[PDB]
Amino acid sequence: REHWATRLGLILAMAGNAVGLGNFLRFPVQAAENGGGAFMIPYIIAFLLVGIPLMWIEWAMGRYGGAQGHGTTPAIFYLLWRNRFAKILGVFGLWIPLVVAIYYVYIESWTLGFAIKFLVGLVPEPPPTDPDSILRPFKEFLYSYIGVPKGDEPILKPSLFAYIVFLITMFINVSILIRGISKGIERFAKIAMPTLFILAVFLVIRVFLLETPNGTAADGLNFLWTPDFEKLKDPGVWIAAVGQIFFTLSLGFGAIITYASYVRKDQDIVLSGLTAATLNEKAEVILGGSISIPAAVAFFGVANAVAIAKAGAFNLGFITLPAIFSQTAGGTFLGFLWFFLLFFAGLTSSIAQMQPMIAFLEDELKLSRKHAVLWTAAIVFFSAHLVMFLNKSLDEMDFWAGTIGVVFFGLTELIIFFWIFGADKAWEEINRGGIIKVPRIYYYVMRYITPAFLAVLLVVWAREYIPKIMEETHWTVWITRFYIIGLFLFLTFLVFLAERRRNHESAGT
Ligand SMILES: CCCCCCCCO[C@@H]1O[C@H](CO)[C@@H](O)[C@H](O)[C@H]1O
Ligand SMILES: CCCCCCCCO[C@@H]1O[C@H](CO)[C@@H](O)[C@H](O)[C@H]1O
Ligand SMILES: CCCCCCCCO[C@@H]1O[C@H](CO)[C@@H](O)[C@H](O)[C@H]1O
Ligand SMILES: N[C@@H](Cc1c[nH]c2ccccc12)C(=O)O
Ligand code: NA
Numbered sequence: 001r002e003h004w005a006t007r008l009g010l011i012l013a014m015a016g017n018a019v020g021l022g023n024f025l026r027f028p029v030q031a032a033e034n035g036g037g038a039f040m041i042p043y044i045i046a047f048l049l050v051g052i053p054l055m056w057i058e059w060a061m062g063r064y065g066g067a068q069g070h071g072t073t074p075a076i077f078y079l080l081w082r083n084r085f086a087k088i089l090g091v092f093g094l095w096i097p098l099v100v101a102i103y104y105v106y107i108e109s110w111t112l113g114f115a116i117k118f119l120v121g122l123v124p125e126p127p128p129t130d131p132d133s134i135l136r137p138f139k140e141f142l143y144s145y146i147g148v149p150k151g152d153e154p155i156l157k158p159s160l161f162a163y164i165v166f167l168i169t170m171f172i173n174v175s176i177l178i179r180g181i182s183k184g185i186e187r188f189a190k191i192a193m194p195t196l197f198i199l200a201v202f203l204v205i206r207v208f209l210l211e212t213p214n215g216t217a218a219d220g221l222n223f224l225w226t227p228d229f230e231k232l233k234d235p236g237v238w239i240a241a242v243g244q245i246f247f248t249l250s251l252g253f254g255a256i257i258t259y260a261s262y263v264r265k266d267q268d269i270v271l272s273g274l275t276a277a278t279l280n281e282k283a284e285v286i287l288g289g290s291i292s293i294p295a296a297v298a299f300f301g302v303a304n305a306v307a308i309a310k311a312g313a314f315n316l317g318f319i320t321l322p323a324i325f326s327q328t329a330g331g332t333f334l335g336f337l338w339f340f341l342l343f344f345a346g347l348t349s350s351i352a353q354m355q356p357m358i359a360f361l362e363d364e365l366k367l368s369r370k371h372a373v374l375w376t377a378a379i380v381f382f383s384a385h386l387v388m389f390l391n392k393s394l395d396e397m398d399f400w401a402g403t404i405g406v407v408f409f410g411l412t413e414l415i416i417f418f419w420i421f422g423a424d425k426a427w428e429e430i431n432r433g434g435i436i437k438v439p440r441i442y443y444y445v446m447r448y449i450t451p452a453f454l455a456v457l458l459v460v461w462a463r464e465y466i467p468k469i470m471e472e473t474h475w476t477v478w479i480t481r482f483y484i485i486g487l488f489l490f491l492t493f494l495v496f497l498a499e500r501r502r503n504h505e506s507a508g509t
């Protein structure tokens with residue numbers, strides 16, 4: 001079985017897993033929508049009580065499962081908890097990460113397409129001072145790229161370039177995955193992470209220099225870092241903060257587990273886990289917060305920036321920032337570095353999203369890596385057509401798998417690992433082999449605070465958001481729901497085949 005060759009590579013691979021589009025796209029928007037500094041207090045708390053605890057828990061299960069030759073939750077759940085129900089719960093460990101990859105890789109392909117176009121100077125030229133006039137040409141460029149409907153019908157007609165760049169993106173993903181863990185993911189992580197950090201720092205540095213009548217980058221940083229206590233009371237802010245934590249640390253997607261399963265049995269996961277998590281937060285707040293938010297603040301002021309963050313998830317990243325850059329000298333080249341940074345950030349994450357499916361096929365159905373990677377690519381590529389051609393299909397997948405699903409899965413794995421599996425056995429399993437021990441306080445957080453914290457959050461979440469689901473929405477959302485439900489059923493079938501194949505092999509001994 002594959003193991004990480006070096007500790008640096010392991011750390012960088014886990015860091016590349018955690019550090020992605022969420023760092024540079026989702027965080028700034030999430031922070032801005034929720035009062036900037038108001039977002040931070042709950043955010044830090046979420047990181048201490050949930051992000052860190054769940055991070056270690058997943059590392060343990062991965063390493064534990066890996067030792068017995070299993071890297072995914074359907075089997076791992078069964079090992080910690082000997083019930084048929086545990087396997088079915090385990091399907092989410094394959095389903096959630098697979099659904100996420102489907103739309104995530106597509107967004108990743110945009111960054112590649114924009115990066116390529118920005119390099120070659122195939123970008124819109126705004127008139128050289130109105131806000132609408134400079135943003136409109138860029139909104140056009142993005143809308144034309146992904147084929148946003150010019151009509152009532154909810155159908156996307158993306159360009160040939162976009163579709164072709166998507167193929168290339170898939171190819172690049174497959175080419176890294178097909179080499180494997182040590183020679184594939186690990187090799188790329190060492191070259192990709194340093195490149196990513198250098199690009200980000202340069203952009204951060206360049207963004208600070210941004211100066212305008214409207215404001216400065218420093219104005220943007222103070223808004224982000226200044227804390228407001230009144231906002232903390234609202235449930236909404238805590239919901240957003242916790243949602244970002246799961247998404248950024250890749251928790252509850254079963255992806256950390258698959259990666260962890262490749263760590264050797266007695267190899268440290270305590271310090272390694274913390275370092276990778278520490279790297280993502282530094283990338284997310286120090287780098288992510290600094291580029292997107294402060295750039296918009298300088299040019300537009302705080303109020304407008306918040307308005308920009310509210311407008312859309314991709315508005316700031318694909319429309320506003322590129323438009324702000326266009327004014328600046330060498331702006332187009334600066335746009336290329338931004339999108340190129342995004343592409344590497346996403347590339348490192350997407351390979352992690354597809355690995356669990358790949359691991360399952362290898363681990364449970366005994367498929368070769370070539371076949372496992374190619375079939376997985378096929379399912380993701382084919383499925384991605386719904387996200388490419390059906391309007392709002394992306395959002396639906398993101399809400400179910402990227403939002404609701406992960407919080408449920410995080411709590412479920414925490415309960416199985418601690419309550420059902422036994423808190424003490426789980427404690428030894430986590431701390432064992434660690435360069436440093438987990439603080440004694442965290443034992444109680446994991447066993448009591450974290451599960452109680454998440455349970456309440458889900459309940460509050462349910463009360464307000466549940467009425468909305470199916471109460472009122474466009475009928476086209478059912479197409480997505482129907483398809484992803486079908487995926488879960490299809491994945492359940494493979495688990496069924498895996499359990500039965502194993503039975504035939506057992507009788508054969
Ligand atoms: C590669 C598998 C067969 C092709 C899948 C059918 C859908 C792809 O079709 C493509 O869609 C793009 C976006 O609308 C268009 O720009 C292209 O002209 C079109 O060929
Ligand atoms: C990294 C390599 C990317 C190559 C981009 C190839 C896709 C561009 O394809 C172009 O699409 C246009 C719009 O349909 C057509 O008008 C052009 O004839 C066609 O060459
Ligand atoms: C949910 C998956 C949807 C896949 C169907 C997409 C097939 C594309 O559909 C085709 O697109 C062409 C543009 O490239 C148009 O010229 C054709 O009229 C149209 O039939
Ligand atoms: N954490 C990634 C996105 C992500 C969510 N779930 C994942 C699972 C595996 C890899 C990456 C992810 C980011 O910050 O952008
Ligand atoms: Na992240």
Ligand code: NA
Pocket residue numbers: 015016017018019020021344345346347348349350
């Ligand atoms: Na990444």
